[PDB]
Symmetry: C2
Subunit: 201 residues, 2 copies
Amino acid sequence: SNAASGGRALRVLVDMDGVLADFEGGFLRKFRARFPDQPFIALEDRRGFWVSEQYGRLRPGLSEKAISIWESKNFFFELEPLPGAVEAVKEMASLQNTDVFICTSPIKMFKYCPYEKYAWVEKYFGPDFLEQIVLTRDKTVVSADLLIDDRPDITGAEPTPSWEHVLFTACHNQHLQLQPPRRRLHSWADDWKAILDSKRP
Amino acid sequence: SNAASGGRALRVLVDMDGVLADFEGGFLRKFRARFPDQPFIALEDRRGFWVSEQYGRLRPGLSEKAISIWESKNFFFELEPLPGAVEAVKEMASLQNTDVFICTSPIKMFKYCPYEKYAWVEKYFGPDFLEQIVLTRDKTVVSADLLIDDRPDITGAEPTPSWEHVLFTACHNQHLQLQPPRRRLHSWADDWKAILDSKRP
Ligand SMILES: [K+]
Ligand SMILES: [K+]
Ligand SMILES: [Mg+2]
Ligand SMILES: [Mg+2]
């Protein structure tokens, strides 16, 4: 909930793919269904942020096939929420002196992805939550106290972002050793309120 | 053009509707075409940011008719650029130590507007410029040195935005007296480089 007039709420950016929406599982399911005769990467064997790069090393032309899954209509809209995500973000947004924004990067092909991300937020959070969406390829130019995001390397035009990046665990990042004092949120069952509270006055 | 590694470019947020794209003229044309038997507001007589509010005072039900124009498919995509806008932003983006982002708010109905704004940027600036789009209802959480925007009142969750808001003249704001030291960019023919340079080190 917003701070009282001109006052200062804790601001939390919550990433979408890999934090709210199960991109990795949705991708794998639809890849295997569309391309049943191709090899695939089990989630436990995922390494590195870019799915298409790992697929492209697996077999010639597989990068392009992988891309064709997330460029397809309904890919983003049909993603399942991660366990606990919707419930946690609803709770978070209801907290005193706490403003939550969903900060998400679209893919390069824009026919469906922006639209379906708005539709997905409406679906799980309601029409009023649409006001909290920030769609951007560069998250460093969005100011906040925290960014909860599964991407390990979050860079852009601002060399010194205002947020602390807390790495949300995903299959592709779970083995990564981070430079102290970087930290993780391991799942939505993990203690996200303690992380928020550590940044409060 | 981006600064050299870890260095600091001037950052400019350029608004879309009313600064790059002629929303007011496109609206009026399509309103008169669809609703030829209704009264309308000539651009010279436009007052206040919200078109639908002025229309709703003109005649019962006209707010809803007005809204139906910008909720329609192709409304955003077909907007004409303002004179000099595309050329100025291309030049601006090519300047040393200058990063340009297009910072735009979608309407509430999201079926077409996000998509068509991306398509419009691709059209006039090319595919690589899509990386510079930030879609948000709250511009105060986007950090920059400048925000060039026709909306007089730009508020949100951040009580002290990092940018200076320079008001871009539009029909609906041209008579407004601003509190010193607020300033204007009167059109793209006006001296936008001097405004940028005033914020440089
Ligand atoms: K990071
Ligand atoms: K303002
Ligand atoms: Mg993510
Ligand atoms: Mg505008």
